Amino acid sequence: LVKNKCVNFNFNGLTGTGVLTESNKKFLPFQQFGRDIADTTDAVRDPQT
Amino acid sequence: QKLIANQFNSAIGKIQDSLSSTASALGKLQDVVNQNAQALNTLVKQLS
Ligand SMILES: *[C@@H]1O[C@H](CO)[C@@H](O)[C@H](O)[C@H]1NC(C)=O
């Protein structure tokens, strides 16, 4: 895992391109995916950590 | 001259108060910004 740079990430089969950084969104234990107003993924929990 | 000056200054003061107040006479500009904003939101939401 790498942060702060453009990378072709793949999380649990979900693919996307972007810059990954720590997020302050306090996801509840059941929550796994955050979405913006455009229904596009903007936050996620890594399965290994 | 002096009376006209006083009236002019008082008018300017009342304009300042009216704009300073909660009045929203600026609605026309707000419409221009708001309409474009919601149009953008609609276009973005269409991707889903
Ligand atoms: C495996 O994944 C779990 C859950 O993210 C994590 O706690 C653990 O450190 C990972 N590695 C090993 C060797 O279990």
Q: Cα(B28) to centroid of ligand 1, in Å? A: 58
A3 Rama class: left (phi>0) / alpha (psi -120 to 50) / beta? beta
Q: Cα(A40) to centroid of ligand 1, in Å? A: 27
Please tell me the total number of residues recorded for chain A in this structure: 49
SS3 string, A1-49, reads CCCCCEEEEEECCEEEEEECCCCCCCCCCCCCEEECCCCCEEEECCCCC
CA-nearest of A16, A15, A17, A20 to A5 is A20
Under an 8 A CB cutoff, do A39 and B41 touch?
no
Any idea which residue has 């910004």 for tokens? B33
Final resolution, Å: 3.8
Pairwise CA distance, residues A31 & B1, whole Å: 74
How near does any CA of chain A get to the CA of B38, in Å?
13
How near does any CA of chain B get to the CA of A11, in Å?
20
Experimental method for this entry? Answer: cryo-EM
